[PDB]
Amino acid sequence: GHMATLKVIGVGGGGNNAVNRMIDHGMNNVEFIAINTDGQALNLSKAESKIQIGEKLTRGLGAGANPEIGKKAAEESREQIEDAIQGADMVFVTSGMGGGTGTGAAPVVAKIAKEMGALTVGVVTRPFSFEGRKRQTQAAAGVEAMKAAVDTLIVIPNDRLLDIVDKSTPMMEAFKEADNVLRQGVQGISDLIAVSGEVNLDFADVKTIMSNQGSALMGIGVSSGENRAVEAAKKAISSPLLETSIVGAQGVLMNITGGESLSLFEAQEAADIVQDAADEDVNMIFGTVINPELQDEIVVTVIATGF
Ligand SMILES: Nc1nc2c(ncn2[C@@H]2O[C@H](COP(=O)(O)OP(=O)(O)O)[C@@H](O)[C@H]2O)c(=O)[nH]1
Numbered sequence: 240g241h242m243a244t245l246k247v248i249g250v251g252g253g254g255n256n257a258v259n260r261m262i263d264h265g266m267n268n269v270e271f272i273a274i275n276t277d278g279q280a281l282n283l284s285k286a287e288s289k290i291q292i293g294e295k296l297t298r299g300l301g302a303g304a305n306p307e308i309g310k311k312a313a314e315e316s317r318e319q320i321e322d323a324i325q326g327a328d329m330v331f332v333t334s335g336m337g338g339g340t341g342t343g344a345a346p347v348v349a350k351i352a353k354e355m356g357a358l359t360v361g362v363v364t365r366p367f368s369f370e371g372r373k374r375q376t377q378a379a380a381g382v383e384a385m386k387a388a389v390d391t392l393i394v395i396p397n398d399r400l401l402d403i404v405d406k407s408t409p410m411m412e413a414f415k416e417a418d419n420v421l422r423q424g425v426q427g428i429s430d431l432i433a434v435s436g437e438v439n440l441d442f443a444d445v446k447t448i449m450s451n452q453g454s455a456l457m458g459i460g461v462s463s464g465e466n467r468a469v470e471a472a473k474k475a476i477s478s479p480l481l482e483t484s485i486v487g488a489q490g491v492l493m494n495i496t497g498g499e500s501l502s503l504f505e506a507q508e509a510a511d512i513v514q515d516a517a518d519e520d521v522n523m524i525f526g527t528v529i530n531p532e533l534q535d536e537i538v539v540t541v542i543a544t545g546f
């Protein structure tokens with residue numbers, strides 16, 4: 240009975256905002272850690288564990304949009320970061336790229352987690368085009384440093400939020416759509432670990448698909464009625480918010496959850512939808528859960544890696 244320890248680590252302002260809004264959902268088995276230079280913002284974190292990094296460097300302020308200060312701050316506090324990560328089997332490092340603390344400290348946090356043997360997944364945003372070319376270039380250097388430091392990376396370009404709002408959608412409601420990329424991935428792994436499937440997948444399968452595998456997609460689709468399996472699988476692989484599409488995926492961990500009505504035929508239909516985008520040589524690990532509490536709903540979940 241292996242019970243994998245998951246930790247979610249927010250780094251910098253945007254990363255800790257996302258963690259705060261996830262905590263408001265009361266996610267149970269996951270440990271949340273807040274890392275920031277900015278002591279004012281950190282004091283408002285809802286996370287159980289708070290690490291103020293770089294206090295001697297920034298005097299308790301943020302990094303002032305300087306990634307070099309964010310990096311140095313994380314290095315100054317390496318021992319406190321190590322202490323906080325201790326015991327993790329999987330770490331999600333979440334951060335907004337383009338500022339000073341996330342850009343510079345998130346790759347250091349990720350490297351420390353990977354050095355300690357944890358499966359390390361980064362979930363980061365790129366800045367809106369309206370924030371300027373300079374911020375975008377700073378963020379892209381952060382993205383590349385994150386790629387070098389993580390097992391798998393999910394990139395959310397903030398510009399994609401402009402594809403799902405109308406002219407009146409509140410900014411905070413838009414931000415919750417981006418938060419949900421992180422939330423569904425964390426929750427989905429948590430479910431995989433906790434629940435015993437009829438075709439059972441576990442953390443070792445997650446490790447095979449995600450360890451040292453570059454870009455990643457973590458998606459979920461829910462549908463009912465006619466064509467529910469095709470529609471749910473299409474939703475799981477078709478988020479408007481991701482940079483990396485599933486085209487070309489070399490690894491897929493896929494699960495279908497339904498009630499007792501879940502048919503073998505619709506399992507095939509869902510798998511074929513996902514296969515018809517991945518590489519012909521994709522390593523597919525397919526699982527199934529029968530949840531008799533469900534009636535007509537089917538849930539398809541996909542991890543796709545390897546581009
Ligand atoms: N989607 C989203 N993006 C954010 C949020 N906060 C900040 N950002 C983005 O993250 C980038 C860096 O900002 P921030 O995390 O505050 O900087 P840092 O604290 O110095 O690392 C910004 O340029 C924005 O693109 C948020 O709550 N949601």
Ligand SMILES: NC(=O)c1c(F)ccc(OCc2cccc(C(F)(F)F)c2)c1F
Pocket residue numbers: 423424425426427428430431432433434435436437438439440441456457458459492493494526527528540541542
């Ligand atoms: N068959 C199982 O043991 C099982 C189970 F009993 C519960 C959930 C499972 O998969 C959840 C999942 C899969 C891929 C991607 C995601 C995420 F949403 F994170 F992207 C989540 C399972 F495989």
Ligand SMILES: [K+]
Pocket residue numbers: 430431432433434435436439440441
């Ligand atoms: K399982």
